[PDB]
Design a protein around this ligand. Structure first.
Ligand code: HEM
Ligand code: 5AW
Ligand code: 5AW
Length: 450
C-alpha cells in the first residue's frame, strides 16, 4: 500500500486505489473500457494500481517510440512477470534480458522472406481443405461457427509448418491435438492482486496449463524431433542443440503453437464478421482477389503482397480489434523520458485498444473504414498510435507469418464463398470482458457457393 502514494507524489493523475485491491475493481468494465475511460478522463498520461503494482499509462507517440524502440535494450527490456510459469520461464515471450536476446535472435531467422515463401505451398494445402470443410456444411444451410472452422485451419497450418508435421485436423473433426491447446476466472484475479503467492505456486508445481497439456508436449515435441533424426523452426532449434536445450526447444514450440492457433482464428473470425456486415467491402475484395487470381487461381506468396485492398481490410480489422489490448514494458532502472521521471519497478503500459479508437487520430473511429488504409491516407497514420503487432526489438516475431497466413485463408474462402448475417449473428458485435480480445458470443454466419 505504501506504494499507493507513488503517482500522488509523482504528480501523475489516476483513479485513486483501494487497499490491497488497487484499481482492480475497475476492470469490472473490462480492461478495454477502463483504459478508454481513463484516456478521456486524465488526458495524456496516468497511473493506476494492479493490486500493488503501479502501472503508468502513456499515450504520446514520441514517448511510446522511446520506450518501445529507443530505450528498449537499456531500460524497457521486459514484460511483467505474470503468474506461475515454471519451465515456460524459458519461452521467448516470457524471458527477460539476456536469455531473451539469445532466444530472440536464435529464432528470428525463422520468419524471413525465404522461410515464408517456403511455407506457402504447405499452408495453401490447408486452404484447399478449408474450402472443402466449408462446403460440406454450407449444404446444411444453417449458420456456421467460423471460429470452429477457422480454428481447425489455424491448427493444421502451424504444426505443418514450424515442425513439418501434417496432422490433418480437417478430414478429422475428431482430434487428439486441439483439445490440449485451448485450455469469470478468479484464479488470475487472486494472483494479479497477491503476487507474493507466486513463488509458492512455483514450488508446488502448479502451472497455468496442467501437467496434462505440457506432459503431452514434453513427450510430443520430443516425438516430432526424434523421427526427423533419420532422413525450419523445429529444424533451426536442432542447429542449436549441438545453445537451445531440451525443454527450451519445447517451450518455444508451445508459444508458437498457441499464438499460431488462437490469434490467427480470432482475427479471421472478426474480419469475416466485418465483411458480412459490409457487403460492399466484401464485394470489392472479392473483385481484387478475382482481378489478381483469375479463374479461381491459387494464391501465392507474391500474389498476396500484390493485393492492396486485402491488406487494407486486414489492417482496418486489426485497428478495431487488436487482440492484445495493450503493450507493456517493465522499467528496470530510474529514467527521465520526454521530461518525465519514471521510477524503477513501474510497468509502463501502451493502451493499443484505446489509441486505435481515439478521436485525435481517427475520424469516425467506431466505423469499419478500410479506406483509411489506402496509399492516399496510409501515410497520415502514426506507427506509434497504430500498434497491432507492438513495435521495436520486442515486437511480434510472428507478424509477417500471421498476415500471410490470414490472407492465404481469406483469399481461398472469398474466391469461393459469400458471408451474410442471420438470426443468431450478434449485431453489433460485443467483445468479451476477459484477457484476450474475443467476441462474447461466437461468430456465426451463413455461407454460399459462388
Ligand atoms: C494477428 C495475429 C497476431 C497479433 C495481433 C499479434 C500481436 C502481438 C503483439 C502486439 C505482441 C507484443 C509486441 C510488443 O510487446 O511490443 C506480440 C508478441 C509476440 N508474438 Fe505476436 N501476434 C500475432 C500472431 C503471432 C504469431 C503467428 C506468432 C508466432 C508464431 C507470434 C509470436 C509472438 C512472440 C514470440 C512474441 C513475444 C516477442 C518477444 O518478446 O521477443 N504472435 N504478438
Ligand atoms: C481453468 C480451466 C477451466 C481453463 N481455463 C482456460 C482459459 N483459457 C482459454 C486459457 O487458455 N487462458 C489461460 C492464459 O494463460 N491466459 C492469459 C494469461 C494469456 C496472456 C496474454 C493474453 N497473451 C497472449 O496470449 O497474447 C496473444 C498473442 C500475440 N502474439 C503472440 S500471442 C489461462 C486462463 C489458463 C482454459 S481451460
Ligand atoms: C480472469 C477471468 C476474467 C477470465 N478470463 C478468461 C479469458 N482469458 C484469460 C483469455 O482470453 N485467455 C486466452 C489466452 O490468452 N490464452 C492463453 C493460453 C495464452 C497464454 C500464453 C502462454 N501467454 C503468453 O505468455 O503470451 C506472451 C505475451 C504477452 N503479451 C504479448 S505476447 C484464451 C481464451 C485463448 C476466462 S476467465
Amino acid at each position: 500500500t505504501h506504494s499507493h502514494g507513488l503517482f500522488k507524489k509523482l504528480g501523475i493523475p489516476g483513479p485513486t486505489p483501494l487497499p490491497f485491491l488497487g484499481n482492480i475493481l475497475s476492470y469490472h468494465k473490462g480492461f478495454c473500457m477502463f483504459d478508454m475511460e481513463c484516456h478521456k478522463k486524465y488526458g495524456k498520461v496516468w497511473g493506476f494500481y494492479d493490486g500493488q503494482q503501479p502501472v503508468l499509462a502513456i499515450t504520446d507517440p514520441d514517448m511510446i517510440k522511446t520506450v518501445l524502440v529507443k530505450e528498449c535494450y537499456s531500460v524497457f527490456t521486459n514484460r511483467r512477470p505474470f503468474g506461475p510459469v515454471g519451465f515456460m520461464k524459458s519461452a521467448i515471450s516470457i524471458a527477460e534480458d539476456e536469455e531473451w536476446k539469445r532466444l530472440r535472435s536464435l529464432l528470428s531467422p525463422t520468419f524471413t522472406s525465404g522461410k515464408l515463401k517456403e511455407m506457402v505451398p504447405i499452408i495453401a494445402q490447408y486452404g484447399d481443405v478449408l474450402v472443402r470443410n466449408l462446403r460440406r456444411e454450407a449444404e446444411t444451410g444453417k449458420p456456421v461457427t467460423l471460429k470452429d472452422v477457422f480454428g481447425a485451419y489455424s491448427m493444421d497450418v502451424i504444426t505443418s509448418t514450424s515442425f513439418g508435421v501434417n496432422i490433418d485436423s480437417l478430414n478429422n473433426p475428431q482430434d487428439p491435438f486441439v483439445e490440449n491447446t485451448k485450455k469469470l476466472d478468479p484464479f488470475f484475479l487472486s494472483i494479479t492482486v497477491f503476487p507474493f503467492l507466486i513463488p509458492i505456486l512455483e514450488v508446488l508445481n502448479i502451472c497455468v496449463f496442467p501437467r496434462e497439456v505440457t506432459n503431452f508436449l514434453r513427450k510430443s515435441v520430443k516425438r516430432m524431433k526424434e523421427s526427423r533424426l533419420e532422413d525450419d523452426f523445429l529444424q533451426l532449434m536442432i542447429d542449436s542443440q549441438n545453445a537451445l536445450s531440451d525443454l527450451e526447444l519445447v517451450a518455444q514450440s508451445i508459444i508458437f503453437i498457441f499464438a499460431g492457433y488462437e490469434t490467427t482464428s480470432s482475427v479471421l473470425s472478426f474480419i469475416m464478421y466485418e465483411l458480412a456486415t459490409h457487403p460492399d467491402v466484401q464485394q470489392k475484395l472479392q473483385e481484387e482477389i478475382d482481378a489478381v487470381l483469375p479463374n479461381k487461381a491459387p494464391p501465392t506468396y507474391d500474389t498476396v503482397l500484390q493485393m492492396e485492398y486485402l491488406d487494407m481490410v486486414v489492417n482496418e480489422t486489426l485497428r478495431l480489434f487488436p487482440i492484445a489490448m495493450r503493450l507493456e514494458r517493465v522499467c528496470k532502472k530510474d529514467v527521465e523520458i520526454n521530461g518525465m521521471f519514471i521510477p524503477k519497478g513501474v510497468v509502463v503500459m501502451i493502451p493499443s485498444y484505446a489509441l486505435h479508437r481515439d478521436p485525435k487520430y481517427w475520424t469516425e473511429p467506431e466505423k469499419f473504414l478500410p479506406e483509411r488504409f489506402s496509399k492516399k491516407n496510409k501515410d497520415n497514420i502514426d506507427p506509434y498510435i497504430y500498434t497491432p503487432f507492438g513495435s521495436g526489438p520486442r515486437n511480434c516475431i510472428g507478424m509477417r507469418f500471421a498476415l500471410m497466413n490470414m490472407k492465404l485463408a481469406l483469399i481461398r474462402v472469398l474466391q469461393n464463398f459469400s458471408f451474410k448475417p442471420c438470426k443468431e449473428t450478434q449485431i453489433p458485435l460485443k467483445l468479451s470482458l476477459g484477457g484476450l480480445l474475443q467476441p462474447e458470443k461466437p461468430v456465426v454466419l451463413k455461407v454460399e457457393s459462388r
